[PDB]
A paper describes a structure:
[name], a psychrophilic [name] obtained from [name] R4, which was isolated from the permafrost of Alaska, exhibits relatively high activity at low temperatures. Here, crystal structures of [name] complexed with various ligands were generated and studied at atomic resolution, and biochemical studies were performed to analyze the structure–function relationship of [name]. The residues located in the active site, including the catalytic triad (Ser128, Asp199 and His227), were strictly conserved.
Four structures were obtained: a sulfate-bound form, the wild type bound to PMSF, a malonate-bound form of the [name] mutant and an apo form of the [name] mutant. The [name] and S128C variants were prepared to investigate whether [name] exhibits the same mechanism as that of dienelactone hydrolase or a classical [name]. Mutational analysis revealed that the activities of both variants were <10% that of the wild type [Fig. 6(c)]. Structural superposition of the sulfate-bound structure and the malonate-bound structure of the [name] mutant with the apo structure of the [name] mutant revealed r.m.s.d.s of 0.4 and 0.3 Å, respectively, indicating that the overall conformational changes caused by the ligands were not critical.
Numbering used by the authors: 5 to 157, 163 to 260
Write the structure that this text describes.
């Protein structure tokens, strides 16, 4: 009943993105959820296959994908090559490619995607990058960060990138002004630096929604490999799904 369709977007040079559309086919347009994996992840990592299917069963047209850096590394690209593809800027560029292909209806089964109702879900570092993309694109109607969100902070490319985009990447400023519904879910058993940044977000932008799951770690327990769900991932899923469905279209 859940259909999974592979796609590949060939980018410039040898860069490419492998992704999946996950969907229960009902011949109607379904709200879109585009999922971004974290810095240590990939589309087949940990809970992502489960999460993609979970949302497809709940009525979403789901896209998840390997960032460019992942396809480069599996192609055996140089260490400098992979490092420069690892910037936040490159996430935003990859995400722009994913969303352009969705909006031009080039992804599989795109006739069943409601591009008028697009949401982002970002894990860890991609929680900050998804907030940035959301803030910069009117067609993103809501964004959810899992154990991420605060501004992105051995890679010299990441240093140059963070240095040249100190204002653009300030998710604290962006969240204070973004009128779209944003949800940040944070596990209590994550590193303190992150938890500190999450309080600064909540103080900067109280208008948004902040959910803490005290006993959950940085992955809600769903690190690789994934044999079963956990209470914490299940909560994050139900809260995220309630957030999108109950608030997306509200004024």
């Amino acid at each position: 009943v859940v259909v999974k369709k592979d796609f590949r977007i060939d980018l410039e040079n040898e860069l490419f993105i492998r992704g999946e559309v996950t969907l229960v086919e009902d011949q109607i347009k379904k709200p879109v959820l585009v999922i971004s994996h974290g810095f240590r992840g990939y589309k087949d990592w940990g809970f992502w296959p489960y999460v993609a299917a979970w949302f497809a069963e709940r009525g979403f047209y789901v896209v998840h994908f390997d960032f460019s850096r992942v396809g480069a590394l599996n192609s055996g690209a140089d260490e400098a090559s992979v490092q420069k593809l690892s910037t936040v800027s490159r996430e935003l560029s990859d995400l722009d490619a994913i969303l352009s292909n969705l909006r031009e209806h080039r992804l599989p089964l795109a006739e069943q995607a409601e591009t008028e109702r697009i949401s982002l879900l970002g894990h860890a570092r991609a929680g900050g990058s998804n907030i940035i993309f959301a803030a910069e694109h009117s067609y993103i109607g809501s964004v959810i960060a899992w154990n991420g969100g605060p501004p992105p902070k051995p890679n010299p490319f990441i240093n140059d990138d963070v240095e040249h985009n100190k204002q653009r990447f300030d998710t604290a400023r962006l969240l204070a002004s973004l009128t779209a519904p944003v949800l940040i879910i944070q596990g209590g058993k994550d590193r303190e630096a992150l938890l500190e940044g999450q309080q600064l977000l909540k103080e900067a932008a109280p208008n948004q929604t902040y959910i803490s799951i005290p006993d959950a770690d940085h992955s809600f327990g769903g690190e690789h490999p994934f044999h079963h769900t956990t209470p914490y991932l299940e909560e994050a899923l139900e809260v995220t799904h309630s957030f999108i469905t109950k608030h997306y279209l509200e004024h």
